[PDB]
Amino acid sequence: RATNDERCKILEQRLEQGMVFTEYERILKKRLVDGECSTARLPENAERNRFQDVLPYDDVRVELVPTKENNTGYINASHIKVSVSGIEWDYIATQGPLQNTCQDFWQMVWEQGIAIIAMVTAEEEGGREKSFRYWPRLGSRHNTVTYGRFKITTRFRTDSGCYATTGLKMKHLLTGQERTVWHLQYTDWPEHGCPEDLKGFLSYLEEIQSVRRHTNSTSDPQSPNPPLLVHSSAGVGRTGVVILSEIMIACLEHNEVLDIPRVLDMLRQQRMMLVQTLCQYTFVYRVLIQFLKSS
């Protein structure tokens, strides 16, 4: 406990001295070398990128089983892994799907064994679409949609104010198998800047943990788990906030010295631009500080 309080004071003083600003600006936004993203840049894939300047690296892009319409099995999504005290935290960071990439998104969900989706954007912001509505609406008369080989059913939904929890069912039409998928949408991110309500975002992170609780069925606590799927509009800024926040809170578990810029450097090696603004980075500090205060 005193170890946590000391780490909390250290976090606060880094914020007080402005050192949080300095350390953020010296973290490179993209790989210095081997960051060509050549597959993402192919002309045939341009329609599959929401933003032409946010792309996955070739070595870590999520590869779909190729189809005739999608020869390279390309989707704008990156595998992210960071080990904390022997436990590998696995994530897939992807853009908000477009109308033409909903089939790819659900194929990705199926092939990667994904059971949890963390959507950290509203569907429209500022009069612009940020994510296609790739999952159906609630209501017995229209709660199903088919995207290629996948029929998706919205089964229930709860609204917790800063976020909503939707239960989905996904069916592989070729073979008939079904899987349940949880969809956790943070709806309170402001149009400009970063949220002032830390508690709401902390309760969202807590709900992600609660859904991991719902879906864990392996007796072995060291047994591997499918990655959490995290997406925003570009899949980098608010997406990085969720991933860095979860990893950093997990670092608080053991006696491992906290090194937030080190962890963010490793994340950016795996997907460019994660935690995309200065206020998002300071927000992570504030979340960790509020977390330690509530311990």
């Binding site: 929401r50 933003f51 032409q52 300047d53 946010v54 509009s233 570009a234 980098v236 800024g237 631009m273 995309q276």
Partner: peptide, 4 residues
């Protein structure tokens, strides 16, 4: 085109 560009995320900003």
């Amino acid at each position: 085109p560009q995320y900003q």
